[PDB]
Amino acid sequence: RRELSEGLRPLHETFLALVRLFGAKGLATRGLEILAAMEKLKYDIRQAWLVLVEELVRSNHLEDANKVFLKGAEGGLRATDEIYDLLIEQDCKVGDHSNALTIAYEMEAAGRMATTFHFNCLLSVQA
Amino acid sequence: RIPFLEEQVRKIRDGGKLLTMDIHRLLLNEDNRFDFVNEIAAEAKQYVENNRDEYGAKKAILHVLSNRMNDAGVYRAEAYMESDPFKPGPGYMKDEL
Amino acid sequence: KSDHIRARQEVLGTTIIGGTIPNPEDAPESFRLLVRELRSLALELNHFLVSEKNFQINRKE
Amino acid sequence: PHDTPASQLELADPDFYKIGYVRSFRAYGIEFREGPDGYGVFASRDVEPLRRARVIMEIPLELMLTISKKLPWMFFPDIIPVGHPIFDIINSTNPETDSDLRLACLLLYAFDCKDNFWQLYGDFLPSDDECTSFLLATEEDLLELQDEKLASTMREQQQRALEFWEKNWHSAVPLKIKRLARDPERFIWAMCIAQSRSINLQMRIGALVQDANLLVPYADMMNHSFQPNCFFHWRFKDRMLEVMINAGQRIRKGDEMTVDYMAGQKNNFFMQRYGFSSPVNPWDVIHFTGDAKIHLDTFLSVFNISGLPGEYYHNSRLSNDGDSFVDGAIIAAARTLPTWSDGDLPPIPSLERKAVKELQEECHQMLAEFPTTSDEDQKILDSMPDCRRTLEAAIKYRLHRKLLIEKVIQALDIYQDRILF
Amino acid sequence: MIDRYKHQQLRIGSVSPQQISAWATKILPNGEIVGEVTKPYTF
Numbered sequence: 204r205r206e207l208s209e210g211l212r213p214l215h216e217t218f219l220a221l222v223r224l225f226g227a228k229g230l231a232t233r234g235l236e237i238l239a240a241m242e243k244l245k246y247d248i249r250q251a252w253l254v255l256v257e258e259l260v261r262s263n264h265l266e267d268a269n270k271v272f273l274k275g276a277e278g279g280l281r282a283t284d285e286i287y288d289l290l291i292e293q294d295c296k297v298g299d300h301s302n303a304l305t306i307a308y309e310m311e312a313a314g315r316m317a318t319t320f321h322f323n324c325l326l327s328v329q330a
Numbered sequence: 331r332i333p334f335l336e337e338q339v340r341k342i343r344d345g346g347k348l349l350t351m352d353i354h355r356l357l358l359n360e361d362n363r364f365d366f367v368n369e370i371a372a373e374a375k376q377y378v379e380n381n382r383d384e385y386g387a388k389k390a391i392l393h394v395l396s397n398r399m400n401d402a403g404v405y406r407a408e409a410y411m412e413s414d415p416f417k418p419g420p421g422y423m424k425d426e427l
Numbered sequence: 428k429s430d431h432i433r434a435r436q437e438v439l440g441t442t443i444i445g446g447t448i449p450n451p452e453d454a455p456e457s458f459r460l461l462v463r464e465l466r467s468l469a470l471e472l473n474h475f476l477v478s479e480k481n482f483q484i485n486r487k488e
Numbered sequence: 489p490h491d492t493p494a495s496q497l498e499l500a501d502p503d504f505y506k507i508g509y510v511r512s513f514r515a516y517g518i519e520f521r522e523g524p525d526g527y528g529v530f531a532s533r534d535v536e537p538l539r540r541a542r543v544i545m546e547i548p549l550e551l552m553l554t555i556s557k558k559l560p561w562m563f564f565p566d567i568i569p570v571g572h573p574i575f576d577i578i579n580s581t582n583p584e585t586d587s588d589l590r591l592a593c594l595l596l597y598a599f600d601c602k603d604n605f606w607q608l609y610g611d612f613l614p615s616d617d618e619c620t621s622f623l624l625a626t627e628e629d630l631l632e633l634q635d636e637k638l639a640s641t642m643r644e645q646q647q648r649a650l651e652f653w654e655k656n657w658h659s660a661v662p663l664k665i666k667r668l669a670r671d672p673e674r675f676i677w678a679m680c681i682a683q684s685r686s687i688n689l690q691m692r693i694g695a696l697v698q699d700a701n702l703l704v705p706y707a708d709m710m711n712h713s714f715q716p717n718c719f720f721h722w723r724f725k726d727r728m729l730e731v732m733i734n735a736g737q738r739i740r741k742g743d744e745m746t747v748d749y750m751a752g753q754k755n756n757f758f759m760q761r762y763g764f765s766s767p768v769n770p771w772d773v774i775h776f777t778g779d780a781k782i783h784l785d786t787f788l789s790v791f792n793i794s795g796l797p798g799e800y801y802h803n804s805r806l807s808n809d810g811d812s813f814v815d816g817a818i819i820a821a822a823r824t825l826p827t828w829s830d831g832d833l834p835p836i837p838s839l840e841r842k843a844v845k846e847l848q849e850e851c852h853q854m855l856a857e858f859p860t861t862s863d864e865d866q867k868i869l870d871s872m873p874d875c876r877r878t879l880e881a882a883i884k885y886r887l888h889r890k891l892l893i894e895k896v897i898q899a900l901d902i903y904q905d906r907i908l909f
Numbered sequence: 910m911i912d913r914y915k916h917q918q919l920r921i922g923s924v925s926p927q928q929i930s931a932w933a934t935k936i937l938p939n940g941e942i943v944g945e946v947t948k949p950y951t952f
Contacts, residue, residue, distance in 0.1 A: 215794070216785050220832045245805045247794040283796070301480035307911055317911055329482075358725045375447050382445045401538050403516050466932065471924050477916040 215246055222251045226258025231267035234259075235274070249280050256286060265293055269302045276309045284315060295324035303328070349392070349410055352399050370394055387411075430455040454487065492742025494530035497523040507608050508706055514546040518745060520709065526614060527709040528744060535739040541732035544718065544745065545706060549727045551605040553594050553703040554691070559583050561590070564693050564700075567601050568594070573665055577656045587701050589652055591686060592678035595703060596668040609705050613681060616673065618877070620763040621680040623649065624673075625878035632882045634858055638756055645760075649676050684708075684762045692724040704729055712762070713746035714770055714816055720747065755885065763881050767888040770800065770816035773824045774896065778850045780843035782903070783835040784827035790906045791818055791899070813902070821896045837908055844904045851897050855890065862890045 206213050218241050225234040234255045238248050252275045259268035272282065272290060287310045294303035307321055342348070360366040374390040385393075392409035399406040414424065428435070434451040441448045454474070462472045474487035489495065500520040504527075508515075519532045535542065549565060556562045561579060568575055574597050578590045598606040616624055622642045630639035653672040657665065669675040685708035690699045707720065707729065717739060718731050731747070733739060750757055754772055755765045788794070791814055794803045800822070802814045825847070865887040869880070933944030 214789055216789060216832075219785075223832065245803070247803060250794075250796060300482065304480060304911075311911055359723065361724075378445075378447050386445060398540075401540060401542070403542050465921075466924065466929070469924055469929065471920070471922055471928075473920050475918050475920055477918065479914040479916060 212244060215241075215251075218246065219251055219254060222255045223258055226255045227262055229259070229262050229264045229267065231255075231259060231264065231271055235271065252280060253283060253286055256282075257289070260289055260293055265297055265299070266302075269294065269299075269306070272306065273302075273309075276313075281313055282310075287315070288320065291321050291324050295327050298328055300325065300328040344412070346410065348406065349395070352395055352404075352406065356395070356398060430457050432456060490742070492530075493744050494519065494521055494532075494742045497521040497528065497530075500527060504612055507605070508551070511551055511605055512546075512548050513551060513706060515706075516544055516546075517542075518544050526618065527612070529710050531739050531741055531743045531745060534741050535733065537736050537738050538733070539735065541721070541735050543730045543732050545729075545731035546723075546726075547704055547706055547729045547731075549693070549729070551609075551705050552729070553591065553598055553606065554700050555587070555590050555594060555702075556698055556700045557583075557587070557688075558698070562698070562700075563594070564691075567598055567604065572597075573662060574668070577665070580656075586648075588679050588682045588686070591682035591701060591703060592675060593668075595678050595682060596675070600664075600668055605705065616677050619677065619680050619684070620877045620881055621684050621761075622759065622763050622878055622881070623676055623680045623683070626876075629876065629878040629882050632879060632886075634860075634886055638759060641760060646676070649679050687720060689720055689722055689729070691722050691729075693727060702729075707731060707747075710745055710747045712749055712758075712764060712766070714748065714751075714766070714768065716746055716748040717743070718745050718747050755888065759881065759885055763878070765881065765885040765888050766816075767891050768816035769888075770819040771823070772817075772820040772892060774821070774854075774893065776824070776826055776847065776850055778826065778846050780846040781826045781828040782843050782847070782900070783840060784822065784829050786835050786840075786907060787822055787825070787827070787903055790903055791822070793819065793822060797823070813899075817892055817895045818899050820892070821899055825896070835907070840907060841904055844900045847900055848897055851893055851900075855893050858886070858890065860886065860890075862887060862894065865890065 206217075218237055221237050222234050225231070225237065238252060238255070241248050241251060252271070256268045256272050256275070259265075259271060269290065272286070275282070287306065290306050291303050294300075294306070303325060307317055307325070310321075311317060357363055357366065370391060373394045377390040377393060378385060388409045388411055390409075392411070396406045396409050417424075431451050431453070433453070438448060465472055475484055476487060477484050498521060500522040504520060505515065517531065517533045517535070519530050521528055521530055529544075552565055553567075554564050555578075561575075568578075574593055578593050581589050595606065598604050599610055601607075614620075622629070623646055625642065630642060633639050650672055653669065653675045657669055657672075657675070669678065682703065685703060687702050687704055687707065688699070689702060690697065691702070692698075704720075710718070710731070716734065717737060718733050721730050721732050723730050731745075733745075739745075749762065752771050755769050758764045758766070758769075788800075792803055792807050792811065793800050793814070794806075795801055800819045802819075807814070865883055869883050869887070872880075930944070935943050937943060
């Protein structure tokens with residue numbers, strides 16, 4: 204806030220560190236506020252959103268990471284294959300088949316097809 | 331250029347065969363025609379939900395097809411709707427045999 | 428256009444206003460009749476659609 | 489008369505479009521203009537950002553030469569009759585490594601085959617003098633390249649071409665084969681045309697979906713760019729290859745339509761296959777053995793580079809004009825420069841200054857390694873207005889590499905300056 | 910290419926008298942049970 208009141212646009216590294224700290228603690232809503240602040244400042248929010256969802260998965264906040272990923276996918280952003288695999292595997296291990304199937308549908312819509320790994324993860328819950 | 335092909339092209343444009351040609355051209359760029367039909371239906375539903383009063387004498391499906399044709403480099407009238415300039419007056423309608 | 432009383436009632440309103448006609452999800456009166464008849468014959472019939480998302484069974488009446 | 493890249497060139501012959509037109513080739517919104525470098529495709533209409541792609545070219549399959557990639561050699565433009573020994577020559581090749589030989593043989597037979605579109609299209613093809621490929625190059629050009637690896641590879645490819653011609657086109661060969669390539673220079677030119685104008689696309693004809701190497705007319709007249717405006721899509725129903733403008737991009741009258749070959753390759757592969765080099769190549773790699781490491785995040789920040797390491801672009805929206813120093817050269821630098829990233833640890837100015845000074849020393853060493861300078865290369869280039877295309881390509885490659893090293897030095901200096909704000 | 914999974918299963922079987930009773934049994938506000946037909950009169 205002091206840097207912003209100073210009239211200087213904050214660096215991308217500062218916002219990235221703030222997003223990482225919010226993901227480590229678990230404050231997904233403040234992370235989305237930071238992402239919107241980055242977007243209104245014309246910064247690209249793909250890498251920051253990926254770091255946010257990765258930290259939320261690591262911080263055991265699976266549902267928050269899932270809804271943040273769904274919001275990002277609805278926005279139009281794309282995700283890396285590792286994020287897809289991590290989200291699907293964690294959702295299937297927890298037992299949430301709905302979010303896993305939704306992430307798989309979003310992945311197939313984004314152009315990446317599904318392999319035997321995702322289907323086995325889904326069948327782990329379907330059985 | 332054939333010399334005596336004015337009336338034929340005029341009748342092709344007036345009758346509505348342009349719609350059939352555009353449908354064939356848009357189906358020549360689609361694997362499954364059923365998904366194309368569903369996509370056109372969804373786009374027309376969005377157009378109707380956006381502006382209800384706009385339609386009623388202008389077809390949203392024809393509007394979608396005309397927008398898709400215009401975005402492809404081919405000029406088409408909006409929703410393939412044309413008026414007869416030679417109409418005699420109000421309340422007078424042509425008889426198409 | 429044939430049997431769905433509610434949908435048919437809504438069709439006139441949607442056409443007069445100009446809104447899009449939603450796809451009916453309830454069973455027609457012909458199916459409901461069958462169920463009633465078969466259950467008069469002591470035979471049950473339930474739709475029982477299952478959601479692929481959360482694996483839950485939902486009865487349609 | 490507004491100055492446009494198309495206006496400087498001259499319009500092409502009407503016949504060039506006509507031969508395709510009578511055979512169903514169709515072009516919408518584009519003009520063909522000839523020049524000193526060669527034919528090129530330019531726009532003739534203002535196109536606003538579109539929701540979907542627009543088709544500028546429709547090229548039928550009956551005007552193309554296509555060979556399948558895998559072992560079953562299927563010629564869907566089946567101009568080779570059964571039992572012809574040209575198929576025996578084509579099949580007697582390794583399936584994986586050598587594909588230009590089969591395309592060259594097919595092009596030669598198409599030139600021989602009557603009532604074929606390529607018989608008329610070959611006149612507009614670049615001649616041996618107009619061709620810029622390094623297969624049609626002397627030893628002087630390979631020596632002027634100043635790169636031993638690339639010169640050795642090109643010499644080995646020329647040797648392979650000569651050996652293949654001497655093996656397949658022997659004296660006892662039938663006359664129908666001998667009339668194809670009577671001299672080895674014709675076969676070398678055929679291989680040059682095949683290599684410099686090959687397209688690798690997946691096509692579907694009927695029920696079969698396969699990947700193949702095709703020689704498509706009117707699609708090889710588009711120049712190369714790393715920010716393409718068009719791409720080669722395939723239409724299976726009409727069995728035509730269509731060039732479509734990228735969606736969401738604004739094209740104005742006079743712009744040059746461009747397509748990308750080998751997205752993600754260094755200038756070595758470009759200079760090897762197409763005989764071309766670009767100073768703004770974002771995939772160039774400069775081998776630095778210095779122990780020093782620059783900070784990647786601060787570098788991309790000071791140079792306003794956004795995106796993942798697999799997709800880098802200059803965010804000119806944050807750029808607010810001004811900085812135009814940023815281009816593909818600095819992107820390739822950031823990709824090749826040794827970088828360190830350790831969580832969120834902030835960079836130290838003294839360590840980064842030592843790193844950039846060591847990098848500048850190593851870059852000055854590498855620049856001194858070449859027995860020439862940028863000014864000397866530019867003077868040699870302007871001194872020879874008309875000369876061999878291969879020598880011009882060689883000196884341009886040298887100048888591009890030297891300018892890349894110089895721009896890396898300048899970018900390191902700008903980083904050292906701007907890091908302390 | 911994950912398909913859109915639609916799962917609908919109609920089921921038929923013999924019904925217990927308890928279910929055919931619960932199809933008609935209703936509890937009025939006073940507390941009586943309705944549903945039993947006992948008189949042949951229609952109108």
